[PDB]
Structure 1
Amino acid sequence: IWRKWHVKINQGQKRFATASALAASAVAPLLMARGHQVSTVPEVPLVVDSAA
């Protein structure tokens, strides 16, 4: 059971990776490369109204 199942990652690196993932999600070709069918959707960083 003592196999060291968990990995300790610096929180700064975790936040760096999250920021990079957010920028990639903002990028439009990267969605198509990841396999998302985004062709009938405008404004890749979609903002839908909070009142809706």
Structure 2
Amino acid sequence: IWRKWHVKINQGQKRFATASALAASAVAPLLMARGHQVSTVPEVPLVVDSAA
């Protein structure tokens, strides 16, 4: 049980990776290359009104 199961990652690198993934989410070719069906989506990034 004392195998190393958990991985310590720098918080700065975690924040870097999260920011890169957020930037990649705004690129419509990357959404299709990841396999999302977004051909009828009116705009990327898609922002819906908070009143809805």
CA-to-aligned-CA distance 1:8-42 (integer Å, 9 cap, x gap): 00000000000000000001100000000010011
User: 1:32 aligns to what SS in structure 2?
Assistant: helix
Instruction: Determine the C-alpha separation between the residues in 2 that align with 1:46 and 1:38.
Output: 10
The gaps in structure 2 that reach 5 residues or longer are none
Instruction: Determine the C-alpha separation between the residues in 1 that align with 2:31 and 2:44.
Output: 9
Runs of 4+ in 1 over 6 A off after TM superposition: none
The gaps in structure 1 that reach 5 residues or longer are none
Q: Which residue of 1 aligns with 2:28?
A: 28
Instruction: Determine the C-alpha separation between the residues in 2 that align with 1:16 and 1:43.
Output: 25
Identity among equivalent pairs (%): 100
User: 2:25 aligns to what SS in structure 1?
Assistant: helix
Aligned-residue CA RMSD (Å): 0.4
Instruction: Determine the C-alpha separation between the residues in 2 that align with 1:30 and 1:22.
Output: 12
What TM-score do the two structures reach when normalised by structure 1? 0.97
